[PDB]
Design an enzyme around this catalytic site. Sequence first.
Site, PDB file in Angstrom:
ATOM      1  N   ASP A 210       0.691  -1.305  -2.925  1.00 32.87           N
ATOM      2  CA  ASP A 210       1.303  -1.808  -1.692  1.00 32.87           C
ATOM      3  C   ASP A 210       0.459  -2.933  -1.222  1.00 32.87           C
ATOM      4  O   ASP A 210      -0.747  -2.820  -1.247  1.00 32.87           O
ATOM      5  CB  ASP A 210       1.288  -0.756  -0.618  1.00 32.87           C
ATOM      6  CG  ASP A 210       2.592  -0.707   0.160  1.00 32.87           C
ATOM      7  OD1 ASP A 210       3.649  -1.073  -0.407  1.00 32.87           O
ATOM      8  OD2 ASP A 210       2.565  -0.298   1.338  1.00 32.87           O
TER       9      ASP A 210
ATOM     10  N   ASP B 249       6.041   5.672   3.620  1.00 32.80           N
ATOM     11  CA  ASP B 249       6.979   4.558   3.583  1.00 32.80           C
ATOM     12  C   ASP B 249       8.408   5.037   3.358  1.00 32.80           C
ATOM     13  O   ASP B 249       9.353   4.401   3.835  1.00 32.80           O
ATOM     14  CB  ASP B 249       6.574   3.567   2.491  1.00 32.80           C
ATOM     15  CG  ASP B 249       5.198   2.972   2.721  1.00 32.80           C
ATOM     16  OD1 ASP B 249       4.790   2.841   3.895  1.00 32.80           O
ATOM     17  OD2 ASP B 249       4.522   2.634   1.727  1.00 32.80           O
TER      18      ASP B 249
ATOM     19  N   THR C  80       5.781  -5.115   2.309  1.00 31.21           N
ATOM     20  CA  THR C  80       4.566  -5.858   2.502  1.00 31.21           C
ATOM     21  C   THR C  80       4.380  -6.931   1.394  1.00 31.21           C
ATOM     22  O   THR C  80       4.081  -8.190   1.622  1.00 31.21           O
ATOM     23  CB  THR C  80       3.424  -4.915   2.638  1.00 31.21           C
ATOM     24  OG1 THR C  80       3.286  -4.172   1.424  1.00 31.21           O
ATOM     25  CG2 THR C  80       3.707  -3.947   3.753  1.00 31.21           C
ATOM     26  N   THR C  81       4.601  -6.504   0.167  1.00 28.83           N
ATOM     27  CA  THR C  81       4.428  -7.433  -0.926  1.00 28.83           C
ATOM     28  C   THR C  81       5.372  -8.571  -0.806  1.00 28.83           C
ATOM     29  O   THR C  81       5.035  -9.711  -1.104  1.00 28.83           O
ATOM     30  CB  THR C  81       4.629  -6.770  -2.248  1.00 28.83           C
ATOM     31  OG1 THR C  81       5.941  -6.217  -2.303  1.00 28.83           O
ATOM     32  CG2 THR C  81       3.623  -5.655  -2.428  1.00 28.83           C
TER      33      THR C  81
END
Lengths: 518, 518, 536, 44
Positions: free
Chosen positions: C63, C402, C96-97
């Site tokens: 992540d 998540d 996030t990435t």
Amino acid sequence: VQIFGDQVTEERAENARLSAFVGAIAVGDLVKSTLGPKGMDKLLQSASSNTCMVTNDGATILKSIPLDNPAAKVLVNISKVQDDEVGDGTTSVTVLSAELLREAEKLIDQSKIHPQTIIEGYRLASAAALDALTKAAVDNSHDKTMFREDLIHIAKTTLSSKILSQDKDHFAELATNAILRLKGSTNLEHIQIIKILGGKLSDSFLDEGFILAKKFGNNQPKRIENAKILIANTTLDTDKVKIFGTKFKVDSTAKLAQLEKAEREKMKNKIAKISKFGINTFINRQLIYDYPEQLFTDLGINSIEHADFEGVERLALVTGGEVVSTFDEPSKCKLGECDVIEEIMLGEQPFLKFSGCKAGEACTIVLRGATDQTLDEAERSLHDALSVLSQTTKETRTVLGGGCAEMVMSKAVDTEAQNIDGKKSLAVEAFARALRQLPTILADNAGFDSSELVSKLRSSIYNGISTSGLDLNNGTIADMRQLGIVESYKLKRAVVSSASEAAEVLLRVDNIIRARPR
Amino acid sequence: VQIFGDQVTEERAENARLSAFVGAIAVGDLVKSTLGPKGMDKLLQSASSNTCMVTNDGATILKSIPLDNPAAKVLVNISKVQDDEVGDGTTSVTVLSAELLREAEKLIDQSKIHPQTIIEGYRLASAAALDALTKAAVDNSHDKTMFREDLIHIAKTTLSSKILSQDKDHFAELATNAILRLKGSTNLEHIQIIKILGGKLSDSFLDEGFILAKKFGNNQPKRIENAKILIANTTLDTDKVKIFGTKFKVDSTAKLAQLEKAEREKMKNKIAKISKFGINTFINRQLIYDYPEQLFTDLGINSIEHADFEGVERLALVTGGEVVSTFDEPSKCKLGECDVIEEIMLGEQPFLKFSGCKAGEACTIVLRGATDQTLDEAERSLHDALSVLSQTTKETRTVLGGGCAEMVMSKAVDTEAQNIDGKKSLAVEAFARALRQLPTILADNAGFDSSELVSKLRSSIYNGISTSGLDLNNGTIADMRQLGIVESYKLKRAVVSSASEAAEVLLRVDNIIRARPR
Amino acid sequence: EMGRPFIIVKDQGNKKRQHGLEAKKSHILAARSVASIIKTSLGPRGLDKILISPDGEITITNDGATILSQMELDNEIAKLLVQLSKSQDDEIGDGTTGVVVLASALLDQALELIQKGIHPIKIANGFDEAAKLAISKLEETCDDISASNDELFRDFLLRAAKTSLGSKIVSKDHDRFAEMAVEAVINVMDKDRKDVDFDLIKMQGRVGGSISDSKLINGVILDKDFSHPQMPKCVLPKEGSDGVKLAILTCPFEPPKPKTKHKLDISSVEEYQKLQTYEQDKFKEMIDDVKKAGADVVICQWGFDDEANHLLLQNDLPAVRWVGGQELEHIAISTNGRIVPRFQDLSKDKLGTCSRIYEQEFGTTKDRMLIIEQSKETKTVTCFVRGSNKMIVDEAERALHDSLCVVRNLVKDSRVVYGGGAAEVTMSLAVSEEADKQRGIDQYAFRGFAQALDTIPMTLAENSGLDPIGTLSTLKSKQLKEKISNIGVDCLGYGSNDMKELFVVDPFIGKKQQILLATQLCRMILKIDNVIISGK
Amino acid sequence: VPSNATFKNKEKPQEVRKANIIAARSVADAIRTSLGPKGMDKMI
Ligand SMILES: Nc1ncnc2c1ncn2[C@@H]1O[C@H](COP(=O)(O)OP(=O)(O)O)[C@@H](O)[C@H]1O
Ligand SMILES: Nc1ncnc2c1ncn2[C@@H]1O[C@H](COP(=O)(O)OP(=O)(O)O)[C@@H](O)[C@H]1O
Ligand SMILES: Nc1ncnc2c1ncn2[C@@H]1O[C@H](COP(=O)(O)OP(=O)(O)O)[C@@H](O)[C@H]1O
Ligand SMILES: [Mg+2]
Ligand SMILES: [Mg+2]
Ligand SMILES: [Mg+2]
């Protein structure tokens, strides 16, 4: 543009996989010699205080040795979980998980397989692997005599790897009796292993009782009969009341002479309540001071002091009584019974011998060996032996070993590789060929052939004989039911799942980020 | 004990071995990308004088890079002598030598075979490989048209990996035409490489006659029709007389002025001896002073000074005449003739271009490019091409390329693998997999699937046909005779023989002794 | 200078400056250095990465926030990307990435436009108009799912649950983790299907076992044993009763003493014997209070001494010690009980109710961890996650966290969109279409954002090993041929670029947040001209 | 479709080619200012 700080080692190329793969190979090759009955013990040189340690288990070895590689931590951590979960098969996870990465190395380099394809084959290959153990297991719960014989053969298998390969015939009866003593209690903390150096290795024994590490205080006798045991956890010695704000407003020292007398009167009154039970032995975990010790002499009660809280649990279950405090109500409270109590001496330290107790829900093992390192190895071995046999009670199903467990998985794994046509078949075959290496290193440690001996085991199982395996004393194929070696289902389920999931870790890694040390 | 002393690294049988194999892996992975037509060139940065070097040859890559590993020094030396013998194929020796040790690493670990037993398999496997390589060859040189075509195919196969891969259709004519002009004389000193900045890579043109980087005198003319060429290894400089030890005793300076008159008259008579032949040019090895230079003006003689030692033979063979120094007897020493002696300019430096000579036994390859790094690659590329084609004149036998030579050699090795009993038969198969790994690498550098083309090529050749090969442009199997891919027989013989000796030296190792450095 | 020491700011020689074009190249290349780390991680075919802390501990994560959080950096431009990934992780918990590579994609395309001489404010204003235009288009094309019943609404969570679990390890047992993740929200939810409380469900991992051993249990996890283990481990309820009658107390078993420091003076032996009587009667009155209340299991916050062990054992009353106050907050909500302060206020209405209490070993000697289970639906679910390694179970925590956050986004009404590269390409071709008539000076600004959105499909093409140009050419031609905009890049190769059929869904609020944080950070980085940095 | 016919290992050539391109372009940025009539002179 160097975004990182000073002294930040980063590897974002093929050297990252090479550094992670060579780290597991170094950890793998370190433990290849420790596997099997003919395996060699290892020696650890500590850096602080020159405290040596001899141990055959890979978990104690890898935790003790320092390794800075991040890949080494995964092999250290998977071995720590296997040591805590089952207590046996840690080196098998370390050598199998490293060999899966070793076999996966040539797929990445030579055949150029995607890392997501190698793990995808291991998912389907591991699924067929556990399914082979579902049908290959056998439930011996219907008969206690056969289950009694199963605990023998499991003790023969686990104890053969350690230094006790000769004396396993005697300790197999000692190991299984401790499990039948506990009658299903799988808690390993209820067995006290008393360490004694000197004497022959076969001089160990298992007395029907609890052996104390301490002795009587001042004048209480050694030999008695028909003693009632009463255990207590409260202070019972110079009672400091629960509120520390207490004080004495003393107007004259003559009245303070009565107050200290009153402290002796209530203590005299408390010991008077102990005598209402009509006991002959009294045990307390706190160390007993002089004044309450003296009052037991006139009453004819024995006193033992400074017992550890973990020993009170073992002491209560062997005696079969109950720990009693607040002694005003002797009716509801319960106390144990014993036939004879006698103080003995094994070496320099004296011990108290109990025999003829009613309850037998626990025991103590007295080991006898030449050195403290051999004695320590013995402890580590019995702990690994009793841990597997303890979980065998809750998991009655067993699996035959000796190379037959790894091969019957490969028989089902190779069958499923054809129905998944494509590039995934090479990954499933790599999982199969990784399982062939466990009987290979088991043959290499004894000094036999790696190719021809494994080839005979290959042809024997596909002919329709699912009981063939390796026999190391003669170097030929023999029947496993006649030799009498077998493992539990939880063990083989654990090492296959632990080694499989361990391979998933260091295959999904491409970049290695190293910050500064603190 | 410590006999070797301080700062001496020693290794014994598990650190000694696996340090040479990882060194063989380290030296092999560098030159893996350089093999094949789609290979990437490696750039070498020097530690001093900021000297860079763009080069594809594996020998030159290992010449410059320092390597303290003793096992890597064996690969450094075998690429040096391979460049000395043939000039091409040094990368194949390093790759095949590393992969032979990579396979033997597994036979020692997995199968547990002695090292001497592995060599005995390689001796029989190498003998079967060379016998198949000898029978797979084909005769040539009976028809000059076929010999002309095969040199064109060898030049295309050699320059396919170098920077001239795109323009090899044009450079093949330039490479093969110069070799046929040698008239059988096998020597690379008769070919000059003139460095010219500017233009593009395909601007290299074939020169008629001989061209070099020299200049006329101060007063000489530009053009002379039908000029007679002479070459003097003479001293037209201040000759002195050679009985060193001559001095001049002088009683009065009247005869000293006449003595200096005799010195000028001595050299005048020597230049008058040159004019008896009636030459039109005069070539001297060393510098010509001004007083000889002025005497060639009225006589109508050109002057060229400061000729290299190689330039004397390179110009004399094209002229056809012989080097003359005495100038005594005009009967012998018949000189040649040249039609056009006019110089030209290519860039900022004028060059003396000749045309219409008697013989063309020496040549000159004019090159054009952007960067000197490309011209250095152009020099090393054509030097390998001209070296292979020059040795093809003396050694007539050739063999098909495109990876078919490796697989057709392994066919006889695999055929002879079955009838050999014992454990060395696995080493005979390990030699076969080493030959198979070369075309496996040719598909990796091209970016195509390697397992499919190797499997299709391997299954195709065992059917009975032996003309199939790898076509990396289309990514499939094709006929090598159609594409015109062929290499010399001595090249692949030297590669297999050198690679067999390379694995033999490093496999007979058990200890490493590294003395203290100076 | 004129010979004198010309100094202005403190520590003049230590800090430096950077301006002009070279200041920009330091910014864009710093983003490309971080983007290369994230580009090979994104997508289902990504690869994990090891972050070695200074203390020797490692974390195997893929992540972007946890990678950038544990990364020691020096360049400030990457430190703003560290906070951008943390911003996406805290609120939405998805992408996030994606933000890190998308912000770099805007920065990489902005490098070419800076070479042309466009002012950075016109570049920043172009992405702001393009971002709102793309959000306005994507809000119209997405469909609502509230019209369907609850049976189909559960399937939409399974569509997003399998999307979030995948690309992470825990992608084997991912079919059961999807059912386990959806089953956690069925218990904890509002009747109106809105504003569910996320704080009721806490994360809890256990180092041991295998992934298959994980299961659902509705209760509390305590890392401790019962007091004085002579009683049976598994206590059962009575034959006829409403429950076990759980009791919780924030008062230790002792005589009542003042909170202030006190001095109890005993000036006589008769008063000293009354202190002994007062000492015993308090413990006698205490055990009679909990006896009459009908409690079976007692939970004490501040522990107690060894005197109460035998009084609790004879009456068949298990108990514990050293239970932290945060766990008592979790016990009261789970068992629906009220925590009484003292025994005088003890009443049967405040006691909780749960099915059964029991404990197991998990192995040899590790620790006795307490387990509680409910007989019906309650307002508390505690995920019982196992793992063969400490890094496996640690990654499984943040992975399942998540997963619950993605389901938490779908609790908001009418926020669903089909991802898989379809959301990026469908927002890209419209921006290029608007530029054809809205040319102005910002014509290349829209083209930069149109090309920057397409990089995430090309990132998926690199990880999957397919040709990027053939992929984007087929997706762009298919979007122009037909206006159906749920076709994307399928990496798992199940055939069919179509995607409702595959079942790939992402939350609509998460997808628009990608371009917002990417555009909002790109507007900030482009404003920087002078770069003053001091030495450490 | 996926997981077939190749896997691109050794991505360091891709990283090296990117480093060489930005290194050459960074040198070109200093030479870019001297182009044309409105260019400037350089003192070294
Ligand atoms: N006498 C024997 N005959 C055949 N096989 C044996 C014998 N003794 C041990 N083995 C085999 O050697 C293996 C020893 O494994 P072990 O060393 O206990 O693994 P770990 O130390 O990792 O728990 C067992 O799987 C067993 O099948
Ligand atoms: N045009 C081509 N098509 C197919 N294979 C080729 C071609 N050119 C060269 N090869 C192969 O490349 C291999 C090595 O070529 P070589 O010229 O020796 O490279 P190097 O000089 O770098 O060793 C040969 O074995 C040959 O089969
Ligand atoms: N099973 C799948 N099939 C197709 N696409 C997927 C799948 N799983 C994830 N994706 C896609 O991969 C992209 C990147 O997701 P990822 O990077 O794993 O999530 P995060 O950025 O939150 O870590 C998303 O746009 C998503 O659409
Ligand atoms: Mg063992
Ligand atoms: Mg060549
Ligand atoms: Mg995600």
